[PDB]
Amino acid sequence: KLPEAYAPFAPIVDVLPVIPVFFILLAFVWQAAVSFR
Amino acid sequence: SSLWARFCEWITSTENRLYIGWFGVIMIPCLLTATSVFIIAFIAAPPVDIDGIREPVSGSLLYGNNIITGAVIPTSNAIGLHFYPIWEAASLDEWLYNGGPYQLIVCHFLLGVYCYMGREWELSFRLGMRPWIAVAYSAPVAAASAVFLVYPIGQGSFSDGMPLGISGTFNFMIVFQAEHNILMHPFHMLGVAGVFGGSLFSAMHGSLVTSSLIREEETYNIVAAHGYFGRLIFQYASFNNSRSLHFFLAAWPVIGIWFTALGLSTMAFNLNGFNFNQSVVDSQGRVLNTWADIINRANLGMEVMHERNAHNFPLDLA
Amino acid sequence: NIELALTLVSLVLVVSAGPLVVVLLSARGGNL
Amino acid sequence: LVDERMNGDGTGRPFGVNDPVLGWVLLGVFGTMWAIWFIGQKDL
Amino acid sequence: MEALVYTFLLVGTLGIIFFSIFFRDPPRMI
Amino acid sequence: MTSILQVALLALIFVSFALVVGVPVVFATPNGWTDNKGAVFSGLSLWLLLVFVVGILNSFV
Amino acid sequence: LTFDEIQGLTYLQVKGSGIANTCPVLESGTTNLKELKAGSYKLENFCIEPTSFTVKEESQFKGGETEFVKTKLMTRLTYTLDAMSGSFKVGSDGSAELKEDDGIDYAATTVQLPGGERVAFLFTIKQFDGKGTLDGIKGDFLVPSYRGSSFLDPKGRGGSTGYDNAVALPARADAEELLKENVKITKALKGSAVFSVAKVDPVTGEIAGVFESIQPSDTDLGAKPPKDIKVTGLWYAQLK
Amino acid sequence: GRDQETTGFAWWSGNARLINLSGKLLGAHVAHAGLIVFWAGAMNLFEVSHFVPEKPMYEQGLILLPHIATLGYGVGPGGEIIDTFPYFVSGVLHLISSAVLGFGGVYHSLIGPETLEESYPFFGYVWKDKNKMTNILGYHLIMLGLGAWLLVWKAMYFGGVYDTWAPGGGDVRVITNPTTNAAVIFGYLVKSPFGGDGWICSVDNMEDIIGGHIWIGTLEILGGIWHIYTTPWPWARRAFVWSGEAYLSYSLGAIGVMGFIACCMSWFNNTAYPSEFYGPTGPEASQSQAFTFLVRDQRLGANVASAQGPTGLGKYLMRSPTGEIIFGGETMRFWDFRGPWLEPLRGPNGLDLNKLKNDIQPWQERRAAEYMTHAPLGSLNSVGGVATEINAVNFVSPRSWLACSHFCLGFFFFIGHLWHAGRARAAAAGFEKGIDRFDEPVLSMRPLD
Amino acid sequence: MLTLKIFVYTVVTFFVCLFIFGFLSNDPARNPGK
Amino acid sequence: LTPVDLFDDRSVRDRGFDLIYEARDLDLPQNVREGFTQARASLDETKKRVKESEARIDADLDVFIQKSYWTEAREQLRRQVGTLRFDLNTLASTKEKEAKKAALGLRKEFIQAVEDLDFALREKDQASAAKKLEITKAKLDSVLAAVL
Ligand code: CLA
Ligand code: CLA
Ligand SMILES: CC1=C(/C=C/C(C)=C/C=C/C(C)=C/C=C/C=C(C)/C=C/C=C(C)/C=C/C2=C(C)CCCC2(C)C)C(C)(C)CCC1
Ligand SMILES: CC1=C(/C=C/C(C)=C/C=C/C(C)=C/C=C/C=C(C)/C=C/C=C(C)/C=C/C2=C(C)CCCC2(C)C)C(C)(C)CCC1
Numbered sequence A: 001k002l003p004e005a006y007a008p009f010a011p012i013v014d015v016l017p018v019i020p021v022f023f024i025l026l027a028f029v030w031q032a033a034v035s036f037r
Numbered sequence B: 001s002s003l004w005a006r007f008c009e010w011i012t013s014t015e016n017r018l019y020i021g022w023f024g025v026i027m028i029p030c031l032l033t034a035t036s037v038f039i040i041a042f043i044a045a046p047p048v049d050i051d052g053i054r055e056p057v058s059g060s061l062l063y064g065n066n067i068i069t070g071a072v073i074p075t076s077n078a079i080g081l082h083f084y085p086i087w088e089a090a091s092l093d094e095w096l097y098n099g100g101p102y103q104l105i106v107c108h109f110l111l112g113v114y115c116y117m118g119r120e121w122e123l124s125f126r127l128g129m130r131p132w133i134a135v136a137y138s139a140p141v142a143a144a145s146a147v148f149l150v151y152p153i154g155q156g157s158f159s160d161g162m163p164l165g166i167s168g169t170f171n172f173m174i175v176f177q178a179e180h181n182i183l184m185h186p187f188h189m190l191g192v193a194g195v196f197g198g199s200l201f202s203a204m205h206g207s208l209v210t211s212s213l214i215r216e217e218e219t220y221n222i223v224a225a226h227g228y229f230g231r232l233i234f235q236y237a238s239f240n241n242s243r244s245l246h247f248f249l250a251a252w253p254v255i256g257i258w259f260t261a262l263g264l265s266t267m268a269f270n271l272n273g274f275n276f277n278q279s280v281v282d283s284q285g286r287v288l289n290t291w292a293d294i295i296n297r298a299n300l301g302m303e304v305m306h307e308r309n310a311h312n313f314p315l316d317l318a
Numbered sequence C: 001n002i003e004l005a006l007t008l009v010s011l012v013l014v015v016s017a018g019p020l021v022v023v024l025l026s027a028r029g030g031n032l
Numbered sequence D: 001l002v003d004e005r006m007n008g009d010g011t012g013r014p015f016g017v018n019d020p021v022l023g024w025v026l027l028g029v030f031g032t033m034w035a036i037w038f039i040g041q042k043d044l
Numbered sequence E: 001m002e003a004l005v006y007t008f009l010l011v012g013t014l015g016i017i018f019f020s021i022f023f024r025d026p027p028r029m030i
Numbered sequence F: 001m002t003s004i005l006q007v008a009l010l011a012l013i014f015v016s017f018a019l020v021v022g023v024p025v026v027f028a029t030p031n032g033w034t035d036n037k038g039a040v041f042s043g044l045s046l047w048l049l050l051v052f053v054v055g056i057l058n059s060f061v
Numbered sequence G: 001l002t003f004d005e006i007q008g009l010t011y012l013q014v015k016g017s018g019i020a021n022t023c024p025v026l027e028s029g030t031t032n033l034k035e036l037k038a039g040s041y042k043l044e045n046f047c048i049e050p051t052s053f054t055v056k057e058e059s060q061f062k063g064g065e066t067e068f069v070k071t072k073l074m075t076r077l078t079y080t081l082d083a084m085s086g087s088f089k090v091g092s093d094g095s096a097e098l099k100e101d102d103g104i105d106y107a108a109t110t111v112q113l114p115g116g117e118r119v120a121f122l123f124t125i126k127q128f129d130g131k132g133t134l135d136g137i138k139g140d141f142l143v144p145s146y147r148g149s150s151f152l153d154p155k156g157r158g159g160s161t162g163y164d165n166a167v168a169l170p171a172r173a174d175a176e177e178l179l180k181e182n183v184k185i186t187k188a189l190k191g192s193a194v195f196s197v198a199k200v201d202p203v204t205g206e207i208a209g210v211f212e213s214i215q216p217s218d219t220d221l222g223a224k225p226p227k228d229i230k231v232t233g234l235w236y237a238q239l240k
Numbered sequence H: 001g002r003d004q005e006t007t008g009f010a011w012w013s014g015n016a017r018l019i020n021l022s023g024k025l026l027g028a029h030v031a032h033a034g035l036i037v038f039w040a041g042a043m044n045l046f047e048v049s050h051f052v053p054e055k056p057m058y059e060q061g062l063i064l065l066p067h068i069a070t071l072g073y074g075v076g077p078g079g080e081i082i083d084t085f086p087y088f089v090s091g092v093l094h095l096i097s098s099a100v101l102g103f104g105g106v107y108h109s110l111i112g113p114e115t116l117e118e119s120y121p122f123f124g125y126v127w128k129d130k131n132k133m134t135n136i137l138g139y140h141l142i143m144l145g146l147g148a149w150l151l152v153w154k155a156m157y158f159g160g161v162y163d164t165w166a167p168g169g170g171d172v173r174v175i176t177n178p179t180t181n182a183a184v185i186f187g188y189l190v191k192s193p194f195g196g197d198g199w200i201c202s203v204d205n206m207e208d209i210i211g212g213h214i215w216i217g218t219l220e221i222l223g224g225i226w227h228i229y230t231t232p233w234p235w236a237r238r239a240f241v242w243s244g245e246a247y248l249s250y251s252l253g254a255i256g257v258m259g260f261i262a263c264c265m266s267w268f269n270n271t272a273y274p275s276e277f278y279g280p281t282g283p284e285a286s287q288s289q290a291f292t293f294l295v296r297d298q299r300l301g302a303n304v305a306s307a308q309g310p311t312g313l314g315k316y317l318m319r320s321p322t323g324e325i326i327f328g329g330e331t332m333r334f335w336d337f338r339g340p341w342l343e344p345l346r347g348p349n350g351l352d353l354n355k356l357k358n359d360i361q362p363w364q365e366r367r368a369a370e371y372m373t374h375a376p377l378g379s380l381n382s383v384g385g386v387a388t389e390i391n392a393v394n395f396v397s398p399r400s401w402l403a404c405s406h407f408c409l410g411f412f413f414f415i416g417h418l419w420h421a422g423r424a425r426a427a428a429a430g431f432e433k434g435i436d437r438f439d440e441p442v443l444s445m446r447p448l449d
Numbered sequence I: 001m002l003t004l005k006i007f008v009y010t011v012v013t014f015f016v017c018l019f020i021f022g023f024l025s026n027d028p029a030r031n032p033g034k
Numbered sequence J: 001l002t003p004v005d006l007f008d009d010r011s012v013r014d015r016g017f018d019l020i021y022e023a024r025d026l027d028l029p030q031n032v033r034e035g036f037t038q039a040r041a042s043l044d045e046t047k048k049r050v051k052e053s054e055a056r057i058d059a060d061l062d063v064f065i066q067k068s069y070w071t072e073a074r075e076q077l078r079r080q081v082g083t084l085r086f087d088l089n090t091l092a093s094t095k096e097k098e099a100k101k102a103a104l105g106l107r108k109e110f111i112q113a114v115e116d117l118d119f120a121l122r123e124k125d126q127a128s129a130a131k132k133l134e135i136t137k138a139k140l141d142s143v144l145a146a147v148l
């Protein structure tokens, strides 16, 4: 488990690992706003 | 002119009835070697102890067997993944008894199919064609590699490799599901979709073009010229581009076969398909059986039977 | 369930960050 | 023992060379081929 | 002699493939 | 103290999220970086400073 | 390779060499056997390396006498009995008793005789009770069934575990096929072995010599008649 | 940004519009590095948070922590995890580092110049400029050499890597005599990939591992200096395609092979991948089962030495085709397996039934029993079990995950090599787009048949 | 059977050499046109 | 038709017959399954095992080195001596402050010696192994004096 001081921050660390997969999705979103020039 | 240069030309010569190439230089001999041994083995090869239990399974048309039953017995389990060159065998008879031909054929065959892929690109570059025909041929080659190399390696024996025969292929498929539940593997599902879909697309594309060119004109130029597009059931514009349609005609089947091949490779590392046995439970805990459980019942039967005398311990970790 | 609740709160804020940047940039005629 | 075998299987011999001849032939064949390639088309 | 019959069939099929590649009708058409 | 490190870590998280959205905006904003780069530097300096504080707090916690 | 020489080599150095399928050689010691003190000694590290496997076979002529014929081993090595412990004694006279107790006393071996016929046999001296002189210690040994009762045939019919009937042909499930179905006889047979001490190393308490044994071949659980297999080779043991 | 009308590449090939944009290309690569470092840090902290000291790491589906544990961090005698804070430090460091790389990439992708050659000549580079390309390779070659030497330093200094084969028990050991003999270091390279030889996967001693990294470290640094002060020779220029896609295809092909090798390493090697943290290997699990029953039956009163099986090839023990005494059963295929728990009972000739009869230590049993249960066999839904098993155990060997994932990665990257390489060669020729419709080569070729 | 090994080893080397040296023979110039 | 023969093997459980089953009980903590907790709990049992390892290191091993039985000597190390490191650690843990620290220091100096001797066996150097073994014996005796 995370140190006691960093324990209250467990929920955040549970969401961090999935952040990278969102970046590729954001790319397609940007192209959508760009209208896929 | 330097003779080596002269030779290099003849090798890259396009005037050859069958384009030879630097890849062919290695492909031709390897495949010729595998074909010769395969023909002699499928006809006169003596029995082989595939299970390494001193129980030799008969093979070749001479030793009984038949076109359907006949097959090239995989190498003995005793050898495992060890290299078994003819010269390593004390006598050619031992090489046949241990199941050496199978290893030799597979080795001289896989190299050939890989070189066949390279030869495809070689001619495409020589003719001035795009270089992705081989990528499509990579899908079948990948599948063959998994059944004749990746899986044998993952399991830890060439005996696990698919036998070079009709009945042997069926045996390999059955035991595989009994131990990996390939049917419940999402990748195998993609592969089945690829072949089932590929057949559907092939039948439709063939029918559309045939009905059109029924008469050099574009595959559908005729129907397009009439303008009576069947958008009634073909209400779409994604494949209006012939290049777009043909691309899909290649992507769908190839990508599917790639997944099924990778699926087989993953299962070769003991990554079996979804296991939902006893997943549905009632309030008090009684197990409510499902179709999955019924499939498991069959898998158990194949498991308890496969290698009747080749298991001295309960768990089949191997 | 407080941990799970604040976990979902974090997921919402983080996931909304990327679209937030785009929407804002698009709104102010940014270089997107 | 009852029979004679190379006894090379399982041994990690470089390029499966269990006899000096094997090693010499491999280098010799490559050297001749290199000479032909270099003479036919100089490398550098 | 069933094996002899089987070998004949296999050999015959291969022979057809042979002529189908080297003794095939010249592809005058594209 | 645990509270000091936790509070400081929370502050770093807030500053981080601000930069996560603010930096890309300023960078892609027409003439929004040449005039706001200094403000970005101020925010970036605070973020790195908070990182150091959290680390020091860890040793004293 | 003497026992100590083998001990010096690591498993990896021995792995792939094949020396593991070879009994240690008593290079030291004396050819004389008189020095061998009279008494009972633990037959530890008893190894039997078969030099040759001959199978008795009628001469070419239909009535040709059945003589042992040369054969070619099909099973890569894996035929040297080793790590066998037993009881060996010697009297003031030539009286010598060699009794095998446990260890790798058995070793399945499939050899091909001239004519492409593979004859499988379980090379073994289980329960050997030799009681001849220091040389020619004649004795008899057990020859357990090559296959166990559990062993199932291709048809699935077997001894303790098996169909016992030709399930394939329902109408002919039970008939003259009885010899092959519901038989699966696993009764053990007997074989004769003779051992002779070529040399004795009194200082190291190690003995080595030649062995000769004729044992029945596999009977396919009674499906086929057994065939005499004459196995001759060298034996090494440490009397400690 | 950019549009297809000005690049000829559609949105699905947008990153291909950055080939000649050195500045933007820098941002893209730098940013991607941020993503990699991010996951390394994020997942590590996630594992640390989801870690429990009552279970082995392999049972907890942890993949990153085993790596740090092998480096000899927060581990103790027997592989027991003493503390996890070192692992937390690694996650925090990587996570914060990823921020720096992320900012650099974003900057070099937005504010940064699309090209650098015009402003920063050193960074400025043009595909085909072999001299510059070789120099760039040199810089990175030196970097990798330094990284390998950092590992070598950790082995002989700043503590030591965990040695599963450590004398008197497995624990971290400071390598003091790393193998530098070229014959031993390069022997693995010329070893057959078949069974027994196991090519480089056979490495079982940390001394060779550290010594091998010493060799690769030096060669890479020297090679970098060479490529930094040398330009491709005529033979090379006449036998290679000089283009960005061609250079990428070369890397794709190489990294693809490396992926396959890594898969085999994780599935077969137990030294570089301690079974204590990564769990038992396929062969290890099989041998463990044979040992478990052999011990149990022997205690019940069975002579495993003279125990003929149904086939008659020995129920518990038998002889390898080579001659070495090996465990009986289908595990005969894994007779070449070597584990720190089985070596003590082995000897010059295969196993030593003497040790098997007496001297079998309790740990040798407990370890085998645990490995047998935690075999690599598993399902996609993580239902631990050989197969045809009920949904009761939730475990999939980390080795299985790494082996399957990296194999698939290697396969795709090899396909990428074929795609990029072929396109690069076609591009150079000029027929990448298609046939001229006026200079069709076939029309000028012999009518063949 | 070493003679068989020596022969195979030579045969293999020869074909492999042809492939390597063959591609070294300015293969990229085999393009139909440019 | 014969009744299945029955044998009184209740003594097997006494001779660690449930070791495998206990190690395979996932419900038990990993330390319990490995037996680490049990040993740490049984001080006398741990101390005994330590003395057994001492005998193997002292009144043994030298034999193989004399006859160049490297395989056996290297296997002599580990095996029963395999737990020695864990054993010495828990005994030192019994100590406190400086006592524990000093004991751990002796444990480390000994562990280093056993590795030096093992490397000598790896290089099959009898002379180095002989002298190295003597050094290892002294180191162990020092650690034993502190841990015991
Ligand atoms: C590793 C993933 C990755 C990366 C690093 C890049 C990087 C890049 N792409 Mg790209 N792209 C990707 C994936 C990726 N792409 C995918 C999957 C697709 C297919 C949909 C595309 C399709 C695509 C096209 C069609 C184009 C690019 C272009 C570009 C370049 C400039 C982008 C632009 O012009 O406007 C920038 C975009 C934005 C400003 C919108 C938001 C992007 C920001 C920078 C992301 C930051 C997120 C993060 C939370 C910020 C952290 C801040 C920090 C303080 C924490 C740039 C170097 C353009 C180009 O240069 O062509 C020559 C272009 O035309 N891409
Ligand atoms: C570091 C490796 C690498 C790099 C730098 C590139 C770079 C490039 N590739 Mg490429 N490729 C690679 C690996 C790589 N590739 C591999 C391994 C394969 C085999 C699958 C391919 C197959 C491939 C094809 C078929 C094509 C390219 C193309 C391109 C160019 C267009 C970029 C683009 O699509 O714009 C923007 C980025 C995108 C549109 C990507 C969209 C995001 C993808 C589709 C989602 C995939 C998510 C994935 C499932 C997550 C799991 C990944 C992994 C764990 C399995 C570009 C320069 C195109 C080209 O024309 O070449 C010049 C093209 O046709 N590549
Ligand atoms: C680490 C950390 C940080 C940071 C974080 C982050 C990084 C955030 C952001 C994140 C992100 C980055 C987000 C984003 C995501 C994405 C999204 C949200 C999208 C989605 C989309 C969809 C779902 C759809 C799509 C589509 C379209 C629209 C187009 C076409 C294609 C498709 C169909 C696909 C913080 C501050 C917390 C602090 C602490 C630490
Ligand atoms: C260019 C572009 C792109 C993108 C790119 C990218 C990918 C970017 C990224 C970048 C990045 C890469 C970012 C990141 C960030 C992160 C961060 C910033 C972090 C932070 C951290 C913190 C704040 C802290 C935390 C903590 C610790 C460590 C301790 C414990 C607790 C906690 C966890 C809380 C795209 C695709 C759209 C396309 C278009 C263009």
Ligand SMILES: CC1=C(/C=C/C(C)=C/C=C/C(C)=C/C=C/C=C(C)/C=C/C=C(C)/C=C/C2=C(C)CCCC2(C)C)C(C)(C)CCC1
Pocket: H185, H188, H189, H200, H203, H208, H209, H210, H211, H212, H213, H214, H215, H216, H239, H240, I019, I020, I021, I023, I024
């Ligand atoms: C660390 C360590 C170590 C070491 C390792 C090593 C030493 C590695 C290296 C490896 C290597 C050594 C790599 C390299 C690679 C390279 C290659 C493999 C080559 C390739 C080539 C190419 C790719 C080319 C081709 C071609 C031809 C020739 C013809 C024309 C065309 C072209 C040019 C394309 C050891 C073992 C102790 C283990 C432990 C750890």
Ligand SMILES: [Cl-]
Pocket: B171, B305, B306, B307, B308
């Ligand atoms: Cl079967």
Ligand SMILES: [Cl-]
Pocket: B310, B311, B312, B313, H328, H329, H330, H331
């Ligand atoms: Cl088994």
